[PDB]
């Protein structure tokens, strides 16, 4: 098991949409890497200037939208690709 | 449903002005991307250094003007384009 530290999240990236809205199959860069992913693990929380840890607003197992860039990192846990990013890189949580 | 986190807003961009002031049709670069858009979702609020969350001045369903750049992120929810920005990137609210 892997759990992150401080204000960071371990997220498994969702499967890329192979088919478009109206049944058209998209392949290649048309099947661009999905920025949505379910949360696999939530860290303890962000450390403020006073030394207090503020728990993250993201919960384990919740689908979230994440921003790719320098803040996201790639790792292989039990031969599965996961991404690591701070809660700032997490944009929003998808509900329903 | 999508709702954001921290000091950020989910905004649906308004349609580009196809017509000019005197009714001249504007196309291409003339019909540029609209900086105005209605707010679809407001986050909980900005977290300060003390650990307190200050609620955002923006409200759901209010038209606001946003600045395009690195702070805006594009996403598709129910096959509709929505932009994501921090409340700092949100410029002003259009009233009346």
């Amino acid at each position: 098991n892997i759990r992150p530290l401080h204000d960071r999240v371990i997220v498994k990236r969702k499967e890329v949409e192979t088919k478009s809205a109206g049944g058209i199959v998209l392949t290649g860069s048309a099947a661009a890497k999905s920025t949505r992913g379910e949360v696999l693990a939530v860290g303890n929380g962000r450390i403020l200037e006073n030394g207090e840890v503020k728990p993250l607003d993201v919960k384990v197992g919740d689908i979230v939208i994440f921003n790719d860039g320098y803040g996201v990192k790639s790792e292989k846990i039990d031969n599965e690709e996961v991404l690591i990013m701070s809660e700032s890189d997490i944009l929003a949580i998808v509900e329903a | 449903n999508i709702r954001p986190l921290h000091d950020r807003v989910i905004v649906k961009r308004k349609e580009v002005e196809t017509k000019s002031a005197g009714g001249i049709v504007l196309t291409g670069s003339a019909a540029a991307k609209s900086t105005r858009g209605e707010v679809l979702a407001v986050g909980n609020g900005r977290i300060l250094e003390n650990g307190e969350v200050k609620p955002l001045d923006v409200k759901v369903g209010d038209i606001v003007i946003f600045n395009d750049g690195y702070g805006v992120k594009s996403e598709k929810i129910d096959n509709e384009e929505v932009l994501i920005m921090s409340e700092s990137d949100i410029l002003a609210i259009v009233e009346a």
């Binding site: 478009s20 109206g22 049944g23 058209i24 199959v25 998209l26 392949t27 290649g28 048309a30 | 196309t27």
Partner: protein
């Protein structure tokens, strides 16, 4: 011996952009029965632009063909994949002719097939292109060298008006090369 080779309707000297479009492997010729015809005045590299058009074609179910400056790379591969996936019978070929003539004979193809050419100058883009915008024909043949359209579904009045316009161009033309291209 002397051989006579006659063709009818639109038949230009361009082939399919990928070998995988072939519906009839025993002849190497793609045969589209009552297909849709899209006329893109710009080259195609991405799949975003005609994605609403491709979805509308998939909803209709009829085969689809593209006449564009060049459909290549990612977009071409996407059409190929959707071709053996069977959702759409899509084939794309290079637009015939060259500058200031490719546009004219593309408009001629639009007049024959009852469609409209998608161009940046004309204003409408492929994103808002619909099934009504696309052209209509009864039969279409693709092979390595030529491309034929049989019974384009277009108005006879528009066809005759285009005939008159190009005949006026013939009469105004002075050089033999332009006049014979117009003929």
């Amino acid at each position: 011996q002397d051989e006579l080779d006659v063709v009818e309707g639109m038949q230009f000297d361009r082939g399919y952009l990928s070998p995988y479009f072939i519906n009839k492997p025993e002849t190497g010729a793609v045969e589209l029965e009552s297909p849709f015809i899209l006329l893109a005045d710009k080259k195609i590299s991405n799949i975003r632009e005609m994605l609403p058009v491709l979805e509308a074609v998939a909803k209709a179910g009829k085969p689809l063909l593209i006449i564009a400056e060049d459909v290549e790379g990612e977009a071409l591969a996407t059409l190929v994949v959707n071709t053996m996936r069977g959702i759409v019978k899509v084939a794309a070929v290079k637009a015939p002719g060259f500058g200031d003539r490719r546009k004219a004979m593309l408009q001629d193809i639009a007049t024959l097939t009852g469609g409209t050419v998608i161009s940046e100058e004309i204003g409408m883009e492929l994103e808002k292109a619909t099934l009504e915008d696309l052209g209509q024909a009864k039969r279409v043949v693709i092979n390595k060298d030529t491309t034929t359209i049989i019974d384009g579904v277009g108005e006879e009045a528009a066809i005759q008006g285009r005939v008159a316009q190009i005949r006026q161009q013939i009469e105004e033309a002075t050089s033999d090369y332009d006049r014979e291209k117009l003929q």
